[PDB]
Amino acid sequence: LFQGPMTHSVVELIEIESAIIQVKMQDRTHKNAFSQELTDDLIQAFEYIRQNPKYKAVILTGYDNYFASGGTQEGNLYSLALDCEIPVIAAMQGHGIGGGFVMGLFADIVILSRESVYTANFMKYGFTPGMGATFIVPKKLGFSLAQEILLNAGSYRGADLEKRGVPFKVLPRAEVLDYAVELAQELAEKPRNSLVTLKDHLVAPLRDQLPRVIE
Amino acid sequence: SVVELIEIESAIIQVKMQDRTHKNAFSQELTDDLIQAFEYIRQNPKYKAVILTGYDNYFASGGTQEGLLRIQQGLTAFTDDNLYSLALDCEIPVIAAMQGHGIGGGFVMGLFADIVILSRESVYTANFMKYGFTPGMGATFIVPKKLGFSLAQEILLNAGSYRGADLEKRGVPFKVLPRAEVLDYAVELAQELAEKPRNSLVTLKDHLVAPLRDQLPRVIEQELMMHEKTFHHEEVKSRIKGLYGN
Amino acid sequence: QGPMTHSVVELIEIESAIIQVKMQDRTHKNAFSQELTDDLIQAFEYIRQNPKYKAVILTGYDNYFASGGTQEGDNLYSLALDCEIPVIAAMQGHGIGGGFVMGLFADIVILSRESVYTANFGFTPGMGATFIVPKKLGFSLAQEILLNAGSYRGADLEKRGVPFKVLPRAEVLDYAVELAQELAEKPRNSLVTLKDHLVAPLRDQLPRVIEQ
């Protein structure tokens, strides 16, 4: 059960169990902003997972208090989880800001942390959310909360979202990863081909509609 | 006028329903002034957010008793005028600050706002079926769209009355506040929206509601078809007479 | 008040306009035997022939709602969906596999805090379940329920945020009756016209994707 980093060493791959792989985002310099290094290393991580079809669950996470921070001051990640053939769990133990929040919403299962901040903050900068965001937030959070989240671009603690009602488990940051592993262990009780077929079914419409409805 | 138009800061326009006489039911005046208020806002590219609200303990009460009788008689339809879509057609975000009771068509009108805020103490109901006729005003579309299909079946089939607090216990995605705070909250949200450029607000709303603007006419048509089957019976006239405001 | 042919479903008239359909195959704990299937089909055909009824309350007995597909090898689920009037699934007992899914085909779904619910189908839930679960529970929560095929107490679902009334088992049937009385105050025509409108797409889409 190995542990390696990717080419620029800002993602670490950690085999938790024979059929569970954890993708750990750890660009400490950029607090996991979408730098070119995090971008390349994440693609590599999911390319590695595609190349080794023994896994039954992916757990995507960040480090300390940062899940992902979205596009940098200078500056396709979203579809990585959606196109991965097996269930991906976004364990958002840390802040999820902008495209970093949205990216988590494309995983099959999403876990929030109570103390962390989440924001689709695009509009705070004057611009509209990617078309990827505008498509996925309503689908994962419902239409009405998506309106509010996208139009106003405000900042939400995990606890406030929890209070407003979201379908995601919301937990103390210190528990998010443990819960994600337990959940990955339960997923791994299934044959890998049943998980893939079922995922194929559940996300067909997204994979079919996302491509076009992207321009 | 029974509708008052208040600017807040530079770019917020408050639309206050205040037909005290009919408790903000759809009197002919309220209807006309609402259409006109929204026409005037659409013509003003200063505005970036609308706050739709009522007065005192009332947000909006839906059809007047005379109103519903005239329809029941075959004289008029809910599609005459077209209130249901005011907030959906408005290019800028609309906040329904439901500081008071939302009843029947008045509740449904408000649900077409991009952001809906309820009062904990007030009552909300899609009470169309209490009178024995089927939901109008886009209720069969916007209620499942905002509150989810499951909860909407219960709301629409049974026509029950819920306090804001009940809806908050069932898990609705709207912010629920004591009544005294609903309008303050709407204002801060509106200022926060007004910080964005207008073109971005309009463009993002266009993208979020295209599918609603596309689909809503076909649902209005289905609903008119259900009205033709259910409105024009004697037991419906008895219900509008005996159960109104009950 | 009388039983169906195999005796494993009791029809109980609560009032003139409210009919209770009680599944009570005690031997199989409301598993999907031939007898339960035939008796439920019989129950819903009786209801169709007796349009004084304006609401149906579908129920199990004791701590069981229904336990799903028979040790043996469906068309069942469309029973509540194709019923002209509103059906309330008062799931006062466990809902396992198909027994959870059948309840989700009712117009109103009431869970019991203390009861266990799962869509637990080496088999993919197929159906059916992958059809109706996201539509009733919402997409995101469905992904979890389906991918993991986990078991949940009613109280767990209530904390995670379902649109269903979730009650102590002891109050479930009482709440169902109160709601059924409120539904029965509407004219029948109104109820059936609205239901036809609300569940038309489901009636449409189910047959196609019951070959797939």
XYZ file of C-alpha atoms in Angstrom, chain A residues 167 202, chain C residues 129-130 133-135 137-148:
19
model
C -27.558 16.947 1.247
C -26.238 7.760 -12.301
C -34.590 2.336 -7.432
C -31.975 4.283 -9.483
C -34.561 7.495 -5.486
C -32.997 10.595 -7.019
C -36.444 11.883 -8.013
C -34.756 12.173 -2.327
C -32.943 14.460 -4.666
C -29.925 13.621 -6.781
C -27.010 14.185 -4.343
C -28.379 12.190 -1.425
C -29.426 9.492 -3.955
C -25.865 9.012 -5.161
C -24.840 8.096 -1.635
C -27.884 5.865 -0.884
C -27.374 4.037 -4.179
C -23.586 3.787 -4.577
C -23.095 2.614 -1.013
